[PDB]
Amino acid sequence: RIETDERDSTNRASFKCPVCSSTFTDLEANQLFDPMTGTFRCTFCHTEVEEDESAMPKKDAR
Ligand SMILES: [Zn+2]
């Protein structure tokens, strides 16, 4: 048959906060990033965020 999966997500540009469960994309990475730690820090609960592998619109089971 035909292949549906091919691009969709790339690797980053989709981080999420482990404390207030918030979320951010790449446009927010250049602003949530911090040199004092070398990572992206939340913006409301200043908690360390982490790339979210489940924050994009997938097939969600057709
Ligand atoms: Zn937070």
Short mmCIF file of C-alpha atoms and ligand atoms in Angstrom, two decimals:
data_model
loop_
_atom_site.label_atom_id
_atom_site.label_comp_id
_atom_site.label_asym_id
_atom_site.label_seq_id
_atom_site.Cartn_x
_atom_site.Cartn_y
_atom_site.Cartn_z
CA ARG A 1 0.00 0.00 0.00
CA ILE A 2 1.11 3.64 0.34
CA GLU A 3 3.31 4.93 3.20
CA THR A 4 1.56 7.51 5.42
CA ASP A 5 4.36 8.17 7.94
CA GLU A 6 7.24 10.17 6.40
CA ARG A 7 7.60 13.58 8.09
CA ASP A 8 5.06 15.11 10.51
CA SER A 9 7.41 15.60 13.50
CA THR A 10 11.19 16.13 13.15
CA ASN A 11 13.04 15.88 16.49
CA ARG A 12 12.47 18.92 18.75
CA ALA A 13 10.34 22.10 18.70
CA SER A 14 7.92 20.40 21.10
CA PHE A 15 8.96 20.49 24.76
CA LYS A 16 6.75 20.00 27.82
CA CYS A 17 7.03 20.94 31.51
CA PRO A 18 7.09 18.13 34.07
CA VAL A 19 5.70 20.37 36.86
CA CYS A 20 2.78 22.48 35.60
CA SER A 21 2.44 20.06 32.64
CA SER A 22 2.59 23.07 30.30
CA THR A 23 4.15 22.84 26.82
CA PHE A 24 6.19 24.82 24.28
CA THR A 25 7.48 24.52 20.70
CA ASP A 26 10.72 25.59 18.99
CA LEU A 27 9.61 29.24 18.74
CA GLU A 28 9.45 29.05 22.55
CA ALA A 29 12.82 27.24 22.79
CA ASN A 30 14.86 30.30 21.73
CA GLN A 31 13.13 32.16 24.59
CA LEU A 32 12.79 29.45 27.27
CA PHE A 33 16.45 28.42 26.85
CA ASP A 34 18.95 29.46 29.55
CA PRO A 35 22.75 29.55 29.53
CA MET A 36 23.06 29.24 33.33
CA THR A 37 21.73 25.68 32.86
CA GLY A 38 21.97 25.09 29.09
CA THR A 39 18.31 24.01 28.82
CA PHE A 40 14.78 25.41 28.39
CA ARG A 41 13.06 26.64 31.56
CA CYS A 42 9.27 26.92 31.92
CA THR A 43 7.84 30.47 31.74
CA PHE A 44 5.18 30.41 34.49
CA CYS A 45 6.41 27.76 36.96
CA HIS A 46 10.09 28.04 35.90
CA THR A 47 10.28 24.22 35.99
CA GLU A 48 12.72 22.42 33.66
CA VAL A 49 10.81 21.38 30.51
CA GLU A 50 11.57 18.29 28.38
CA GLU A 51 10.97 17.29 24.73
CA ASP A 52 7.47 15.80 24.43
CA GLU A 53 7.20 12.85 22.00
CA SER A 54 3.40 12.93 22.36
CA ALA A 55 2.44 16.59 21.78
CA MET A 56 1.57 16.50 18.06
CA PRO A 57 -1.56 15.57 16.11
CA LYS A 58 -1.01 11.91 15.11
CA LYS A 59 -3.44 9.31 13.71
CA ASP A 60 -4.95 8.82 17.19
CA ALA A 61 -6.23 5.48 15.85
CA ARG A 62 -8.40 5.91 12.73
ZN ZN B 1 6.40 24.93 34.36
#
